[PDB]
Each structure stands twice: as C-alpha cells, then as structure tokens.
Design a binder for this molecule. Structure first.
Ligand SMILES: Nc1nc2c(ncn2[C@@H]2O[C@H](COP(=O)(O)OP(=O)(O)O[C@H]3O[C@H](CO)[C@@H](O)[C@H](O)[C@@H]3O)[C@@H](O)[C@H]2O)c(=O)[nH]1
Ligand SMILES: Nc1nc2c(ncn2[C@@H]2O[C@H](COP(=O)(O)OP(=O)(O)O[C@H]3O[C@H](CO)[C@@H](O)[C@H](O)[C@@H]3O)[C@@H](O)[C@H]2O)c(=O)[nH]1
Ligand SMILES: [Ca+2]
Ligand SMILES: [Ca+2]
Lengths: 149, 149
C-alpha cells in the first residue's frame, strides 16, 4: 500500500506528479553531499539525496524514512530547514523511456557529521562532498540539484 | 492530463495527490469558502483548491485552478505562498472504499468580489467568513479551519 508493486508505480508515474523530499546535506566544513545516480531518471548524474513520499505517509514520517534510506542516518523533520518548493521534469522514468516523470519537490537543508552517515550503495555508485562553487561548475551535476546552490 | 476514471482511481489508491489551496480574502477581512458537492470533504465548507496534473507546472496549475475555482484567472505571482499542508480523508472522489491523501501548497491573496464568477460545479453555496465564524463551525472542515488557527 505504501511501497507499490511495479505495475502500480508505473501507472502512478505515467499519470500524476510524484511528491518528493530533496536533502541539501552540509558537512562541518561547509561542503554538500552529492551521489552519482544509478537509477533513472537523472541516471548517471550527480544529484542531492532524496526520494518520494508514499500513500498515506505523513511528511514527518517520510523525512525519517528517507533520511535513513538515503544517508543511513534517521533524522526528524525538525532538523531540516525548509528550502522551497521545486519541480523536476524528466523525459524518462524508472522503467525506461516510454513515459516522463514529474516530481513536486520539498527541499530541506541540514548539517551532519560525515563520520555518522552510513551511505548506502543501492541508488548511488559514488558520493562526494563538494563546495557550492565546485558543484555549480560541473555539467555532470544535474541542473535540478545545481539550482539549490 | 485529466485522467480517465479507472486511472484516477488507481492513482488515488496508490499515491498522494498534489494540490493548491486558495485562502482568498475580500475587502472586509473575510475569506471565501464553498460548500463542497464532491468527496472527499463532501458537504463541508472548504476553501477553493484543486490538484496539479501530470507534467503541469505549478505556474500553469495556479492559472487553471483560479479560473476553474473562482471564475477568474490569476497568475501565481498574485499569490503569497502560505505553507505546505497534508490532508488525509477516509473516502475518495467516487466512493468510500479507499482513502485520499493530498500534499497541499497554500496560497493567500485578496480579490474584489465583483471580479469573480463563482462556479456551481463543485460547490452548492459560497460565503465570505471571518476567521472567528469559520473557526466556530464544525461544518467547516478541520483541514480548512487550520489555515486560520
Ligand atoms: N516498485 C516501486 N518502486 C519505487 C516506489 N517508489 C520509488 N521506487 C523506486 O525506488 C527507488 C528509490 O526511489 P526514491 O528514492 O523514492 O526516488 P528517486 O527516484 O531517487 O527520487 C530522487 O531523485 C530524483 C531524480 O534525481 C529527484 O528529482 C527527486 O526529487 C529525488 O531526489 C527508485 O529506483 C524508484 O524508481 C514504489 O512505490 N514502488
Ligand atoms: N476522472 C478524473 N477526475 C478528476 C481528476 N482530477 C480531479 N478530478 C475530480 O474532478 C473534480 C475537481 O477536482 P479538483 O478541484 O482537482 O479536486 P478537489 O476535489 O476539489 O480537491 C480540493 O478539495 C480537497 C477536499 O476538500 C482538498 O483537500 C484539496 O486540497 C482541494 O482543495 C473532483 O470531482 C475530483 O475528484 C482526474 O484526473 N480525473
Ligand atoms: Ca532516492
Ligand atoms: Ca476543487
């Protein structure tokens, strides 16, 4: 009912906007975390960690599930600074190139201690901590992440 | 993308809707509520608002929805962003067999009553209510009352 069967997720992505939380994650030196995405959309691009909110899931609960899933560290929504509403449009989707993906995105910024994360490998094949100037200069960082800086 | 009934049902069953709610003020410090004829929140006084469609920008949705809800097209620049809210209902647009979930973007703006053309498709009556009056009535849905808390 929350994590959908692929068939139902496909209908959802084809038919309506997804709602996601994007995390602008700072370290103690003022650098920010980007992961190199292994899944579509934005496959192969460096992107901020984040993910979609599920059916009947509160934003408070989603924030905890997603920080744990993306960073290996569960944080409460009270730790985040609301960072605006954004919109991400991609010509492809998780399953291929047959339809587009649309996210309405809630940004949240917060600082962590790098040593306390347990970065997972399911959705990203590499992670880097970059300065705003550095990430803004690279076309390998997706435009939808660059705009946060 | 106005979905056929089958796919709207699958969408509502499976994922949050994204909507814009309008906190609309007149020249008397009163706010517009309509008595809803559709589920969810059927039969309650509620602020005007509606869902964002697939591949529709928030800017375009604001124009479409102000026109559809108020009879007057307004650009998103007319609205003052008024938070992210979450509405959970035990019923849905076509029955009582599954729940509806909205992630909601609120917008506040003032209008001249004589410039609106209030439609009758989704509401059977409209009133401009003071915060005190709307807070004192259980016929105003809790999800609208909280905008004035
Ligand atoms: N079967 C199934 N798969 C799902 C579901 N929800 C997500 N997935 C898949 O599970 C993986 C993790 O999904 P998320 O972490 O929720 O979303 P995401 O696609 O990483 O979203 C992030 O990246 C986008 C593209 O860069 C961003 O635009 C977005 O805001 C967010 O940061 C992805 O492979 C996604 O396709 C579901 O209900 N069912
Ligand atoms: N078939 C179909 N029907 C749709 C679709 N989108 C909306 N509808 C239906 O078309 C009508 C108008 O839709 P909206 O204005 O988008 O939604 P809503 O029912 O008004 O939602 C508003 O009220 C909720 C309950 O009070 C609020 O919680 C919400 O934020 C918003 O103000 C409603 O009968 C709704 O069920 C679609 O893609 N396909
Ligand atoms: Ca993710
Ligand atoms: Ca409506």
């Amino acid at each position: 009912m929350m994590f959908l069967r692929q068939e139902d997720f496909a209908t959802v992505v084809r038919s309506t906007p997804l709602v996601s939380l994007d995390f602008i994650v700072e370290n103690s030196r003022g650098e920010f975390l980007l992961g190199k995405r292994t899944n579509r959309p934005a496959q192969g691009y460096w992107f901020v960690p984040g993910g979609r909110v599920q059916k009947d899931e509160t934003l408070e609960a989603a924030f905890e599930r997603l920080t744990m899933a993306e960073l290996g560290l569960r944080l409460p929504i009270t730790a985040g600074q609301f960072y605006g509403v954004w919109q991400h449009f991609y010509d492809d989707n998780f399953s291929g190139t047959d339809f587009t993906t649309h996210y309405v995105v809630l940004g949240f910024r917060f600082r962590v201690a790098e040593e306390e994360l347990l970065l997972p490998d399911e959705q990203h094949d590499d992670y880097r901590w970059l300065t705003p100037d550095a990430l803004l200069a690279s076309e390998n960082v997706h435009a939808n992440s660059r705009v946060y800086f």
